[PDB]
Amino acid sequence: DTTSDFHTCQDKGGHCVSPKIRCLEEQLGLCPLKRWTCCKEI
């Protein structure tokens, strides 16, 4: 991508969390970094 235009993480569910964060509910989206999960609240 040249710009953020897609189904992101924080938008449909919750914010992007680094692969060591308390996930209340894990969901699917786009986070630009690493193994960052889209977590619906922490």
Curated annotation (Swiss-Prot):
- Give the superkingdom in one word: Eukaryota
Q: Where in the cell is it found?
A: Secreted; Cytoplasmic granule
- Expression sites by tissue: Detected in outer membrane of the vitelline layer of the egg (at protein level). Expressed in the liver, gall bladder, kidney, testis, ovary and male and female reproductive tracts. Expressed in the ovarian stroma, but not in the ovarian follicles. No expression is detected in bone marrow.
Per the record, the similarity remark reads: Belongs to the beta-defensin family.
Q: Give the protein's function.
A: Has bactericidal activity.
Protein name, as recorded: Gallinacin-11
Organism for this UniProt entry: Gallus gallus (Chicken)
Q: Which gene encodes it?
A: GAL11
